[PDB]
Symmetry: C2
Subunit: 137 residues, 2 copies
Amino acid sequence: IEDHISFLEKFINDVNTLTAKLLKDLQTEYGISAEQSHVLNMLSIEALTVGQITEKQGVNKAAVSRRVKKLLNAELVKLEKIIKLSNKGKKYIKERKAIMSHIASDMTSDFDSKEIEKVRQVLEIIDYRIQSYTSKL
Amino acid sequence: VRRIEDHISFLEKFINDVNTLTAKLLKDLQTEYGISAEQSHVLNMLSIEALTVGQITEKQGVNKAAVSRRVKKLLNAELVKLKIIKLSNKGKKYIKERKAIMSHIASDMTSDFDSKEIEKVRQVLEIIDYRIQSYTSKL
Ligand SMILES: O=C(O)c1ccccc1O
Ligand SMILES: O=C(O)c1ccccc1O
Ligand SMILES: O=C(O)c1ccccc1O
Ligand SMILES: O=C(O)c1ccccc1O
Ligand SMILES: O=C(O)c1ccccc1O
Ligand SMILES: O=C(O)c1ccccc1O
Ligand SMILES: O=C(O)c1ccccc1O
Ligand SMILES: O=C(O)c1ccccc1O
Ligand SMILES: C[As](C)(=O)[O-]
């Protein structure tokens, strides 16, 4: 019970740690931090307002506005307030994906996609539930 | 041809949501112990196995200025007993409470799944974690 949660946390830190490493060059080449990168990542799924990003990240709305403002000054993001990636933000995400995809696909090339979709399903239901507790108090 | 990007995205959205929920569930407790979430993360590490500033900076990742300064503020708050580094009564107490809360919720969100379903999820995550390590050690 406790070891599962403990495992998930080591798993989360290891994923984040490898990602930070795999993406550091790219981020510096663009002059952005990991948090701005992470917002760029959220926006590649779809355009969002500062409010939705706040909800997703869980932080203070102004810490998000701060990242977004830096992103606009860097022109990696454009307005209408609906935020969406700009052409520069799009190039960034394509390189981020190219990188992340390369490693992931090599790392999972032997996975049985029939077995895996059952795992994805359990994780989608868990994510659903996570977002709901979050939704409330 | 390349839907892997969608799986990675999901995994990232999932990790993101777990962090968001964890921070919210643990904010009041971290406050009662007069510590922040970043300090909480670090204490979560030492409950695993006692360590030093070398190991910590690596696993942590990019930390080259105020990561050693967060170690300091732990001693002052009496959460790290020392070479080695262990949790103090205060430090172990916090982590115990932290585990309680996390487990209660991890149990509720999971009790209806079948053990077979969960064990297979654990197996996939474990091997991804094994390969991440068997990776984040080469270069
Ligand atoms: O059982 C687990 O360790 C586990 C870990 C992460 C996500 C779902 C899970 O069942
Ligand atoms: O870094 C770890 O080994 C770790 C382990 C469990 C929970 C959080 C963590 O950062
Ligand atoms: O840029 C990201 O989306 C990111 C995610 C996890 C860890 C480090 C990072 O830069
Ligand atoms: O840590 C934050 O305040 C933050 C804010 C926006 C996006 C990613 C983040 O980590
Ligand atoms: O069936 C798979 O592809 C699989 C992959 C990793 C771990 C356990 C598994 O069954
Ligand atoms: O997308 C998946 O099927 C998946 C499965 C296990 C772990 C992370 C994942 O994204
Ligand atoms: O939508 C999110 O909250 C999200 C978070 C992390 C990575 C990709 C994402 O779409
Ligand atoms: O406080 C923690 O140990 C923690 C861990 C993961 C995500 C957010 C957090 O606050
Ligand atoms: C941590 As930043 C450079 O996105 O304000």
